[model samples]
Structure formats: structure tokens, C-alpha cells
Target: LSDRELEASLQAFFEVHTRLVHRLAGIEPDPRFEILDKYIFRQIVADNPEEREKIRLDYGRAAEIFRDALARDITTPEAFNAYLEALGPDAVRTVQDLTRRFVDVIRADPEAIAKLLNISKEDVQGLARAGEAAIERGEGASLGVLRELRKIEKKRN
Candidate 1:
């Protein structure tokens, strides 16, 4: 894949990872989630003690490491499929749905996504471009725009 293609994959993965981390950070602790977090940490560090120590001292470095790992790892359809399989279909599907919602909101108001994700507007746009490509390429489900809008038909009542 080209550099931009790899970056697109990285940003897509990072967006989902950041969302999950933020959500988990807000909720009550669970060993299962903790284990999952540690597994990601280990994968990012990947036998690199220097990087591990850097992340230990500077928690923000985790994001950089995460992007690096995603770029290195999920660079192709086969690799991405392997990753989804590792995480299981349910978890992968849930994140893809959440990501679709996120991109949909960004399509409506660009600034909010940049603010919510703590990324620049350009980065948000890059993610949107990548998501659009993914949909076009049939990488994920395309519940049509009107179909997604019809979700509101099912009221809480």
C-alpha cells in the first residue's frame, strides 16, 4: 500500500481505538477491559523496552505508538481481515458501526469531530476520506444513508 493508504488505515484504526479507550476510561473498571488494554499495549510496544519505558513515562506517547503499530500491521485487506478475526466479528462490527456514526456526524459538522477527537480538522477530513473509500471499496457495510436515518423510527418507547 502507498503511504497515504497506510496512513488512512492507521487513522481509521486509531479513531476506533481512541473511542474505545475514552469510553472505557469513563466507565467502571473491569478485568476483561483491563486485559484488553494491556494486550494492545503489549502489541504496540512489541518487545521494544525503550518504547515501553517511553510510554510508561509519557502516557500520551501511547497514541503515537498505536498509530505506528496500526500502520505497520493493518496495511492490507488480508491483514485487516486477520485483525478483525482476532477481535471477533461482534467487537469489530460494533466499532465499525460506532465509527460510521462518528463519520456521519463529522459529515454534518466538521469542527465537532476535530474537537471531540482532539485532532486537527485536516486529520478529521482525512479520516472521512478514508471512511468513504472503505465504504466504496466494500470494506464495511453500507447501510444506505436513508436506511441509517430510519433508525430513528424505532423509538425508546
Candidate 2:
């Protein structure tokens, strides 16, 4: 396809993707979304470099989704505790690893993660550092976000 044709094609797909996103995730997407979207967008990018550029121009739904998820209590301590309890030792260990990695990954993308978490970059760095310290000390990392998990908007009927 010509450059213009490629752009048009990407734009068309972008709209389709956006609409489906709103219908499914129900919020504007962004970098956090991009993280997840990247996994899905990988093939498209490989198939159409032009589409990658076009989509890169417009990617914010993930941050919105993250914020919404946070607000809804999907990532709070209580949620984690309950999850750990339900899943027992194995799950708890898995959660600990996942949460550590999650914080690390999220912090790496400071702007997007901070926006999603509704915190400053400093806050994220601090929290992550503290969490890391907790992990190292074997004191216990916070599951604050997990605790609040169920508080979600629940638009899904």
C-alpha cells in the first residue's frame, strides 16, 4: 500500500479498535493500555509499520483503564489478602512475585503509570522503593491496591 493508503488503513483499524475498546473496557486508552495493547499490536506493527506509527499517535486508553481499575479497588491490599487466602501459599507466592514485577514494570513507565495510579512519579518511585525494601527485608509488601479491588465501577451488567 502507498503511504497514504497505509495511513488510511491504520486509521480505519484504529477506529474499530477504539470502539471495541470502549465497548469492552469502557474508557480512554493510553500507555498502560499500550503495554497490553503492545502485545496485541505487535503483529499488526510487524505486518504494517505504518499502522504502528498511526496508533502510536493515539494511545491513552490503558492509563484510563488503569486509573479506573485502581479506583474500583482492583489492586488493593484487601483484594490481595483475600486472593492469597483463597489461593493459599502457592498463590500468595505467585502474587508476591507478580506484584513486585507489576510495580517494577509500572514504575519503569513513570508517566503512564503515575497517571493511572493517580500519583506523582515521586510517589511511584517511593512506593516501589519501599516495596522493594519490604521484599528484601522480608517484612511484607503492601497489598493496598489489592484490598480495594472490588470497588470497581462495574458497568458490566
Candidate 3:
């Protein structure tokens, strides 16, 4: 993948990972998805060590095969979905719903939106406005505003 593609995939994966972590926080994660969650955790740790101890402490240890999956580029949506399936359909739907409602999430968490997109609060407000206008117009909208946000983020960077 090109640099941009890789960055896009990584951000998308992080968003999914964040939503999953948030959802699984209150409820006990199904044992069936434990291995899959470990895999996701490993990928996050591999890319960002600052997140390692926090995740390990929050989630638990990783298996050898989970680390092995890190040797490949598993940031694509297809790979993410497969991992979620390994968790359960509920995990998949949770992530799908989260991505679908990401605009609202952005509005709710301006700091997170700014951090993830590497933009400012002002920029996020602009995005929110653009997104709201698109929805109101009822013409058409970016399938994923997060993607469009990243596109603009990339150009700015």
C-alpha cells in the first residue's frame, strides 16, 4: 500500500479498536472473542508502544499467533471484519454502527476527533458543518466522513 493508503487503514483500524474497547469495557467480553481481541491488541501495541502497557493491563496477555498476525498488513476493512468475526457478529455490528455514526461521535468528542485526524478544534467544527449540510441537502454524502476528514487531513499535513 502507498503511504496514504496505509495511514488511512491505520486510522480506520484505530477507530474500530477504540469502539471495541469502549464497548467491551462494561460487559465481560465473550471468551470466544478473547483470542481475537488479543490479536487486535497486539497490532495496536506493535504500532504504538505507549499503548502497550495500558492495553496489556486492561485486556491481558497476547498469544504467539496473535503476534504473528502482526507480521502482515492487517489494517484493511476486510481484515478487520475477519478479526471481528473471530470475535462474533456482535463485534462486527458494533463497529459498523460506530463507523456509521462517527459524525456524531466526532461532535461528541472534539478532542478525539482532532487528535485522530491531526487537525484542530476549528477544523473539526468545519467538518461537522460540512457533514450536517450534506445530510440536510439529501443529495448525497461521503460514504464515510471519517475518510473524507482524513483526506483533508492528509492534504493539510
Best by TM-score: 1
Candidate 3 residue lDDT tens string, 116-155:
5467787767666655564454311222243345446566
State the local distance difference test value for candidate 2: 0.42
Candidate 3 positional error at 72, Å: 32
Error in Å for residue 4 of model 1: 30
What tens-digit string does per-residue lDDT give for candidate 1 at 21-140? 333233332333233233333443444445554433233333443354355544344455465567567645544644364445446455754565455576555555655665566443
Q: Would you list the clashing residue pairs of candidate 1?
A: none
State the lDDT at 80 in candidate 3: 39
Q: Please write out the lDDT profile of model 2 over residues 28-145, one tens digit for every residue.
A: 4433333333333443444457555543333333233323434444433344356445646754554455336544554466575566656567655665565566556543333222
User: Tell me, what's the RMSD of every candidate?
Assistant: 16.7, 12.9, 14.2
* TM-score ranking from best candidate downward: 1, 2, 3
Off by over 4 Å in 2: 1-93, 143-157
